[PDB]
Amino acid sequence: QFYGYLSQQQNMMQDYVRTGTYQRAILQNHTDFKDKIVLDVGCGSGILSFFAAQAGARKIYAVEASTMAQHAEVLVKSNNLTDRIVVIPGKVEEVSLPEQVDIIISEPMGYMLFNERMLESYLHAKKYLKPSGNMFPTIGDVHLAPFTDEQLYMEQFTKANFWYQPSFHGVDLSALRGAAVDEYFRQPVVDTFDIRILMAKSVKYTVNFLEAKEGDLHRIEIPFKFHMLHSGLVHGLAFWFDVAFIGSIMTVWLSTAPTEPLTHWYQVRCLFQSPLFAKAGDTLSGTCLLIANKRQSYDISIVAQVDQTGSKSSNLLDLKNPFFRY
């Protein structure tokens, strides 16, 4: 229902970097839309389907599982486009298209790209794509980089140490302190930061939406080896994402990087249980394993070590309970 509120649709429609970038990607690639058949997966209010119609699309199937499909239908009648935009209420996995499409368009990106698991519906929809058909967005780049943030690490313990007291109104809470720390460290942090907390150049993990299958997103293994630019304590990994619309005329990027004006995706940070001392020139190696979970999110398993010392840390986070710290 969350996406079923006009207020929620307004917040994303009003977001210029999101909505304006999609319009630019589509209108500046008019040859990928001029007289084509289009699928808009999770169209919400239908704004992306209108942009395709502005670019000259012959037919646009606009699929929406929420009751927003009803409001999208009103906008298409109201905009005199019932001949070119057909709104199909229901799940993209369960509806019927009358024909194969030239191009699929969607805004399925969650926090850290993968959160909400909508990329699975986007990829599922390629059963409707013509061989040599296009995907907008075409690729997603997930960037991860080690960060130092003593204050963000220490505040976990400030919060958890609420339980480390022998007489909260006469009650010894101290037996729960360990569980409270564990629960706080299992929360990915959604907020932004100064790029100078980054201790190494990002590693990039690329999903090619033309090639990737639905099941590819159930388990995402991101090996990393960071060459440390700075000496300090590594508190965790920072995550962001770019997507590219690779059209016939040009590639348009939507970036959520900390070097770009802040978006409503912010960036995501996952703390280590224990920070790792690295000197500039050291290598920090390990694996980030994203495992799709039953709460339309991911279990995040990180293991990392400073190769030169053998110092090792890990964390297990659930992207379903993020801490909005902004």
Ligand X SMILES: CCc1ccncc1CNCCCCSC[C@H]1O[C@@H](n2ccc3c(N)ncnc32)[C@H](O)[C@@H]1O
Which residues in this chain contact its own copies in the complex, by CB under 8 A?
A: 5-7, 10, 13-14, 19-20, 23, 45, 47, 50-51, 54, 71, 74-75, 77-79, 159, 162-163, 168-176, 179-180, 183-184, 321
**261 to 280, contacts with ligand X by CB under 6 A?**
264-265
Name the active-site residue from 102, 116, 242, 282.
Answer: 116
Question: Does 151 count as an annotated binding residue?
Answer: no
CB nearer its own copies, residue 179 or residue 195: 179
Neighbours of 6 (CB within 10 A): 12
Question: Does 117 count as an annotated binding residue?
Answer: no
Min separation Cβ 64 and ligand X, Å: 5
Question: Does 186 count as an annotated binding residue?
Answer: no
Question: Does 64 count as an annotated binding residue?
Answer: yes
Backbone φ and ψ of 53, nearest 5°: -65, -40
Question: Does 121 count as an annotated binding residue?
Answer: yes
Amino acid occupying residue 2: F
Is residue 260 part of the contact set for ligand X (CB under 6 A)?
Answer: no
CB proximity list for 98: less than 8 A, separation 6 or greater: none
CB proximity list for 147: less than 8 A, separation 6 or greater: 193, 197, 198, 199, 234, 235, 236, 237, 238, 269
94 is catalytic: no
Tokens of 39: 């699928």
What does 121 interact with, of ligand X, its own copies, none (CB < 5 to 8 A by kind)?
ligand X
Min separation Cβ 278 and ligand X, Å: 31
Min separation Cβ 39 and ligand X, Å: 10
* Distances, alpha carbon 200 to alpha carbons 119, 155, 226, in Å: 28, 24, 6
For residues 9 and 6, give the distance between their C-alpha atoms in angstroms, rounded to a whole number: 5
For residues 75 and 57, give the distance between their C-alpha atoms in angstroms, rounded to a whole number: 17
What does 146 interact with, of ligand X, its own copies, none (CB < 5 to 8 A by kind)?
none
Is residue 46 part of the contact set for ligand X (CB under 6 A)?
Answer: no
CB 208 within 8 A of CB 282: no
Residues labelled as active-site residues: 15, 107, 116, 264
- Binding-site residues for S-adenosyl-L-methionine, in ranges, read 9, 18, 42, 64, 93, 121
